Amino acid sequence: LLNMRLRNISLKSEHCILSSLDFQTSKASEQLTKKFIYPQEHNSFLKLNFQEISYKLIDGTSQIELDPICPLKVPLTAFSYDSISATFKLVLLPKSTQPHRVKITLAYELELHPNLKLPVRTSWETSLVNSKLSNVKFKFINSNIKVIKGEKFTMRLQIINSSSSPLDLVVYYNNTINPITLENQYQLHNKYRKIAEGIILLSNDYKIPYFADLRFIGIMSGYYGTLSGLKVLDLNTNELIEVGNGASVLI
Amino acid sequence: PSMDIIPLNELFSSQVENVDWIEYVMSKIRAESNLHSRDFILLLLDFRNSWIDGIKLNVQFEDFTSNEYHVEASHTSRIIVPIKKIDYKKYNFENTPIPRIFPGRQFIQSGLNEEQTIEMRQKFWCREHIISKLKCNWKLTTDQSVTGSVDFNKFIEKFDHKMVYTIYPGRLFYGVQLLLDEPKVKVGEIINLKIITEPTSTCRRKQNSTVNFLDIVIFDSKTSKILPRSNRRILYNGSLTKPISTTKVSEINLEIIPIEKGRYEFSVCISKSNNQDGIIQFDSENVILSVI
Amino acid sequence: ELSAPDTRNDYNIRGDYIATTPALITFDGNESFINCYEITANNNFDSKDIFNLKVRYNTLKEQLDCFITDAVLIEGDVEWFILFEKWKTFWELEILKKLKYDYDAFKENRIIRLLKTSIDLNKTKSKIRNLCIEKAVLDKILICLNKVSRGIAVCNTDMDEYVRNLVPKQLTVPVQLPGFEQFFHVQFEQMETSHDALHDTIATIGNSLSYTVIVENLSGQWGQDVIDDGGYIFEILSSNEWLIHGQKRCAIKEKRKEFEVHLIPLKKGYLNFPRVEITNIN
């Protein structure tokens, strides 16, 4: 009851859940010690946090922070430190423990000594393109973020199919404007315009035959996150697989 | 088998001077300051052999000569050719294409209206322009003396509405450029702007509504245009509706003073009335400035 | 127009809108008319002066009524010699009940009347001594204006020096804040995802209350989100405030606050009170 602490956990896409703990001197404790300190004419407190650490599991391992941290001391403040946990594909929820050491130094070198230790579970409170029909999956083997200029470049698809008939699909980019509140109308027009002529495929209408190298050239500068022009058509039972993957900046 | 025509808007600064069209188009842009960018259109046509041996397939335009490609046996290889636009006011595209004979009556009650005839004349005479300069002069790699030419007349089939927009700007409704004084202006300064407007020969199509409404939109160079409150942004006198008229060389000159940042692009929009969904032309001249 | 008071500082209002070439506006609350003024601060701090404006205007009803009078029934001076110079006030009393359609007058039409009465107006003109040399013109003009539409051209040609412009005014006292601050921070982003190429905003805004605080929002990122945790070091210059954040994260919500209105305040150091918090993440 001197510094209220909370922990926030987020799930990054790079298979590393990041959990950040936040500490803040609570206002009720602030006024509680503040009137008794201002009786002796003190305006700013001094809670010296000298040893803050987090532990892992039933065997105690000290996972470090993401940056440096000295031994600080301040009043009426808040500070947050972020550790990087490991992403779990199973349903084993990791339970961690944190500990601090607040030295509540009253003045003229007459200090008290306080320590605290919480322990809880680091929950989070709740791409590979796959089709809807068959076993056919898509994933770009080369890193989906890429930094290019407006020059010629290459990109690499990959197909994991049912081995019964691996062939009979075609790719094409469809360089035409999709046929569409004037402000939202023109915003959707600018999205559909820079999609339809931003990059151009240097081999479209292209029969596939488990790799498939397909080659572009990029014209217009900008970050094309989930570049969604190119559209792999499946010949038999005529449907379309969108490929919402890959993101190329062109600067 | 197929063909498509796409324009370009980036300037293509150098060290990308290895790709065959880029040096020619940037050479024409580079000197001759009236020979500007933003109006070049690339045509994308795909050569595909049905043979057993490789070919070389050099493409000659009226002055553009491409590199030496290599199509092996059954593949496509999209050879990208630059071409400028064709000016509507300099030319005439509303005359009937002639027949060869003068003998037959040819069912002289022709079953066509006015506007269907005129769009048929446009659709024919645009490919009449783009065929009468295009060539190719091929050779086999393993035989080297079997060099022949090709035609294009039995290959290009027809156009659609997208090709006649992209090749011919006379199909559009207005012709606009922009004039800006200083593209590197400091923030405490107000700069006059200019929007020239020059209507088309498709102004005959409506003939009744003598006003159209030039909207103004503003977008951060990245994405996601700014709502017209324009705080932290361009501080602007007047309002962005600015009525213009048919058959007029009007100039809706405005003023613009920045607040925070640099990367701004300016463009227009034509909407034919003031209500929702009256829109006709999403005009896209889209010039840029900076504020340090 | 805009006018500067008698205190007479170096206020440089570069903004001054003159609608010389257009005699046109509309205020039907569909689009948004914004006027703006690029003023300057004084030679020192100056927080309470008085500004008064000058809007000339008209209303569009008597704009189209002036157009209809000057080019529908009194175009030439031949009819203006006799047929309307003896019944001008009667023409105004007839014109005041015209009630032209101002709902389709902003969409491809101008000077177009609504469905108002035109039957008993002929009987009302016939009741007085109105001669047929004017009763033909005053009926034919209303019959023409019952279904006609003009354009934006030849509107200023009727509006030119034929309208009393009510040059109204207002009062704008150029309101000010209370607690001046001057801070500058610096960041160093420990990258979770490599860089998301964020777009920046160096704010300048002051909080004006008592027992209050200054709350800041981080920069805006537009690539792959939820990441790029930015570390920071304060160097909170020229004051002694209270800080309430350390080594935040540039995702969905960070809100790196700074409790300001507690101790070590100052006066109005400028036109308003300021806090020119310029972060610099290099």
PDB file of C-alpha atoms in Angstrom, chain C residues 140-265:
ATOM      1  CA  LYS C 140     -44.715  37.061 -69.001  1.00  0.00           C
ATOM      2  CA  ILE C 141     -41.775  37.479 -66.602  1.00  0.00           C
ATOM      3  CA  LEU C 142     -43.504  35.433 -63.887  1.00  0.00           C
ATOM      4  CA  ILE C 143     -44.564  32.847 -66.485  1.00  0.00           C
ATOM      5  CA  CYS C 144     -40.958  32.591 -67.696  1.00  0.00           C
ATOM      6  CA  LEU C 145     -39.524  32.451 -64.162  1.00  0.00           C
ATOM      7  CA  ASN C 146     -42.035  29.726 -63.225  1.00  0.00           C
ATOM      8  CA  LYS C 147     -39.831  27.344 -65.253  1.00  0.00           C
ATOM      9  CA  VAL C 148     -36.336  28.646 -66.111  1.00  0.00           C
ATOM     10  CA  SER C 149     -32.777  28.115 -64.908  1.00  0.00           C
ATOM     11  CA  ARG C 150     -29.682  30.303 -65.194  1.00  0.00           C
ATOM     12  CA  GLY C 151     -25.989  29.650 -64.552  1.00  0.00           C
ATOM     13  CA  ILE C 152     -23.184  31.149 -62.480  1.00  0.00           C
ATOM     14  CA  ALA C 153     -22.239  33.379 -65.405  1.00  0.00           C
ATOM     15  CA  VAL C 154     -24.122  36.717 -65.625  1.00  0.00           C
ATOM     16  CA  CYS C 155     -24.755  36.702 -61.861  1.00  0.00           C
ATOM     17  CA  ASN C 156     -22.054  39.191 -60.872  1.00  0.00           C
ATOM     18  CA  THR C 157     -23.140  41.297 -63.875  1.00  0.00           C
ATOM     19  CA  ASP C 158     -26.457  41.826 -62.069  1.00  0.00           C
ATOM     20  CA  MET C 159     -24.916  41.860 -58.574  1.00  0.00           C
ATOM     21  CA  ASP C 160     -22.485  44.694 -59.450  1.00  0.00           C
ATOM     22  CA  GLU C 161     -23.326  47.809 -57.356  1.00  0.00           C
ATOM     23  CA  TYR C 162     -26.957  46.781 -56.864  1.00  0.00           C
ATOM     24  CA  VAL C 163     -26.916  45.432 -53.298  1.00  0.00           C
ATOM     25  CA  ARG C 164     -26.615  47.099 -49.888  1.00  0.00           C
ATOM     26  CA  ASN C 165     -24.006  44.969 -48.127  1.00  0.00           C
ATOM     27  CA  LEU C 166     -24.630  44.627 -44.388  1.00  0.00           C
ATOM     28  CA  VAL C 167     -21.028  44.894 -43.138  1.00  0.00           C
ATOM     29  CA  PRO C 168     -21.483  43.010 -39.886  1.00  0.00           C
ATOM     30  CA  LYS C 169     -18.938  42.568 -37.116  1.00  0.00           C
ATOM     31  CA  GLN C 170     -18.156  40.336 -34.152  1.00  0.00           C
ATOM     32  CA  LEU C 171     -15.723  40.194 -31.229  1.00  0.00           C
ATOM     33  CA  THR C 172     -12.779  37.818 -30.797  1.00  0.00           C
ATOM     34  CA  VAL C 173     -10.548  38.474 -27.806  1.00  0.00           C
ATOM     35  CA  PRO C 174      -7.779  35.915 -28.683  1.00  0.00           C
ATOM     36  CA  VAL C 175      -8.083  33.687 -25.593  1.00  0.00           C
ATOM     37  CA  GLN C 176      -5.070  32.540 -23.574  1.00  0.00           C
ATOM     38  CA  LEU C 177      -3.911  29.736 -21.302  1.00  0.00           C
ATOM     39  CA  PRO C 178      -2.453  30.018 -17.794  1.00  0.00           C
ATOM     40  CA  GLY C 179       0.576  27.770 -17.127  1.00  0.00           C
ATOM     41  CA  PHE C 180       3.641  28.259 -19.315  1.00  0.00           C
ATOM     42  CA  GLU C 181       6.065  25.367 -19.759  1.00  0.00           C
ATOM     43  CA  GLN C 182       9.065  24.626 -21.984  1.00  0.00           C
ATOM     44  CA  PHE C 183      10.257  21.025 -22.283  1.00  0.00           C
ATOM     45  CA  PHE C 184      12.166  18.830 -24.733  1.00  0.00           C
ATOM     46  CA  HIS C 185      12.625  15.052 -24.586  1.00  0.00           C
ATOM     47  CA  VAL C 186      14.644  12.497 -26.548  1.00  0.00           C
ATOM     48  CA  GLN C 187      14.006   8.837 -27.322  1.00  0.00           C
ATOM     49  CA  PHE C 188      15.872   5.677 -28.331  1.00  0.00           C
ATOM     50  CA  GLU C 189      13.654   2.866 -29.621  1.00  0.00           C
ATOM     51  CA  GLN C 190      14.625  -0.667 -28.606  1.00  0.00           C
ATOM     52  CA  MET C 191      13.154  -2.465 -31.599  1.00  0.00           C
ATOM     53  CA  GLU C 192      10.798  -5.390 -31.150  1.00  0.00           C
ATOM     54  CA  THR C 193       9.905  -5.441 -34.839  1.00  0.00           C
ATOM     55  CA  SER C 194      12.806  -3.906 -36.756  1.00  0.00           C
ATOM     56  CA  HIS C 195      11.344  -0.483 -37.619  1.00  0.00           C
ATOM     57  CA  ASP C 196       7.781   0.438 -38.529  1.00  0.00           C
ATOM     58  CA  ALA C 197       8.759   3.900 -39.945  1.00  0.00           C
ATOM     59  CA  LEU C 198       6.622   6.025 -37.650  1.00  0.00           C
ATOM     60  CA  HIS C 199       5.355   9.527 -38.425  1.00  0.00           C
ATOM     61  CA  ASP C 200       6.070  12.236 -35.884  1.00  0.00           C
ATOM     62  CA  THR C 201       4.334  15.190 -34.246  1.00  0.00           C
ATOM     63  CA  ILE C 202       6.266  17.666 -32.085  1.00  0.00           C
ATOM     64  CA  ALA C 203       3.400  19.160 -30.102  1.00  0.00           C
ATOM     65  CA  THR C 204       3.059  22.650 -28.612  1.00  0.00           C
ATOM     66  CA  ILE C 205       0.055  22.866 -26.281  1.00  0.00           C
ATOM     67  CA  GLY C 206      -0.354  24.027 -22.679  1.00  0.00           C
ATOM     68  CA  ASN C 207      -2.739  22.975 -19.912  1.00  0.00           C
ATOM     69  CA  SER C 208      -4.633  25.787 -18.156  1.00  0.00           C
ATOM     70  CA  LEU C 209      -6.249  24.659 -14.894  1.00  0.00           C
ATOM     71  CA  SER C 210      -5.429  24.245 -11.199  1.00  0.00           C
ATOM     72  CA  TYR C 211      -4.034  21.037  -9.622  1.00  0.00           C
ATOM     73  CA  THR C 212      -3.699  19.787 -13.199  1.00  0.00           C
ATOM     74  CA  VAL C 213      -1.296  17.900 -15.456  1.00  0.00           C
ATOM     75  CA  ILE C 214       0.019  17.690 -19.019  1.00  0.00           C
ATOM     76  CA  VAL C 215      -0.800  14.504 -20.928  1.00  0.00           C
ATOM     77  CA  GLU C 216       1.057  13.619 -24.124  1.00  0.00           C
ATOM     78  CA  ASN C 217       0.388  11.111 -26.895  1.00  0.00           C
ATOM     79  CA  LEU C 218       3.108   9.225 -28.757  1.00  0.00           C
ATOM     80  CA  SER C 219       3.963   9.341 -32.455  1.00  0.00           C
ATOM     81  CA  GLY C 220       1.865   7.558 -35.080  1.00  0.00           C
ATOM     82  CA  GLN C 221       3.147   4.348 -36.675  1.00  0.00           C
ATOM     83  CA  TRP C 222       1.685   2.890 -39.845  1.00  0.00           C
ATOM     84  CA  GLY C 223       3.514  -0.373 -40.679  1.00  0.00           C
ATOM     85  CA  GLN C 224       3.205  -3.677 -38.761  1.00  0.00           C
ATOM     86  CA  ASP C 225       1.862  -2.616 -35.388  1.00  0.00           C
ATOM     87  CA  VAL C 226       1.872  -3.685 -31.679  1.00  0.00           C
ATOM     88  CA  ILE C 227       5.627  -3.216 -31.297  1.00  0.00           C
ATOM     89  CA  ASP C 228       8.662  -0.857 -31.409  1.00  0.00           C
ATOM     90  CA  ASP C 229       8.962  -0.163 -27.685  1.00  0.00           C
ATOM     91  CA  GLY C 230      10.624   3.239 -27.340  1.00  0.00           C
ATOM     92  CA  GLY C 231      12.887   4.020 -24.409  1.00  0.00           C
ATOM     93  CA  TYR C 232      13.261   7.632 -23.352  1.00  0.00           C
ATOM     94  CA  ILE C 233      15.249  10.093 -21.250  1.00  0.00           C
ATOM     95  CA  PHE C 234      13.538  13.270 -20.126  1.00  0.00           C
ATOM     96  CA  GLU C 235      15.801  16.325 -19.562  1.00  0.00           C
ATOM     97  CA  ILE C 236      12.734  18.282 -18.401  1.00  0.00           C
ATOM     98  CA  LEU C 237      14.212  21.752 -18.807  1.00  0.00           C
ATOM     99  CA  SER C 238      13.183  25.166 -17.429  1.00  0.00           C
ATOM    100  CA  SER C 239      10.809  23.838 -14.711  1.00  0.00           C
ATOM    101  CA  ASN C 240      10.457  21.136 -12.070  1.00  0.00           C
ATOM    102  CA  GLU C 241       7.356  19.119 -12.968  1.00  0.00           C
ATOM    103  CA  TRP C 242       6.459  15.517 -12.084  1.00  0.00           C
ATOM    104  CA  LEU C 243       6.991  12.749 -14.642  1.00  0.00           C
ATOM    105  CA  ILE C 244       4.898   9.587 -14.753  1.00  0.00           C
ATOM    106  CA  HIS C 245       6.393   7.317 -17.441  1.00  0.00           C
ATOM    107  CA  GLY C 246       9.666   5.515 -18.175  1.00  0.00           C
ATOM    108  CA  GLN C 247      10.563   3.283 -21.195  1.00  0.00           C
ATOM    109  CA  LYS C 248       7.108   3.015 -22.761  1.00  0.00           C
ATOM    110  CA  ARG C 249       5.911   1.144 -25.870  1.00  0.00           C
ATOM    111  CA  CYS C 250       4.731   2.874 -29.101  1.00  0.00           C
ATOM    112  CA  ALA C 251       1.734   0.508 -29.656  1.00  0.00           C
ATOM    113  CA  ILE C 252      -2.046   1.072 -29.127  1.00  0.00           C
ATOM    114  CA  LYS C 253      -1.826   3.012 -25.844  1.00  0.00           C
ATOM    115  CA  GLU C 254       1.171   4.365 -23.925  1.00  0.00           C
ATOM    116  CA  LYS C 255       0.203   7.927 -22.817  1.00  0.00           C
ATOM    117  CA  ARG C 256       3.527   9.180 -21.460  1.00  0.00           C
ATOM    118  CA  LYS C 257       2.137  11.766 -19.039  1.00  0.00           C
ATOM    119  CA  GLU C 258       3.811  14.586 -17.102  1.00  0.00           C
ATOM    120  CA  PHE C 259       2.149  16.102 -14.016  1.00  0.00           C
ATOM    121  CA  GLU C 260       2.805  19.809 -14.534  1.00  0.00           C
ATOM    122  CA  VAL C 261       0.421  22.089 -12.596  1.00  0.00           C
ATOM    123  CA  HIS C 262       1.682  21.285  -9.094  1.00  0.00           C
ATOM    124  CA  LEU C 263       4.782  23.396  -8.399  1.00  0.00           C
ATOM    125  CA  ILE C 264       7.199  25.922  -9.978  1.00  0.00           C
ATOM    126  CA  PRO C 265       4.798  27.743 -12.277  1.00  0.00           C
TER     127      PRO C 265
END
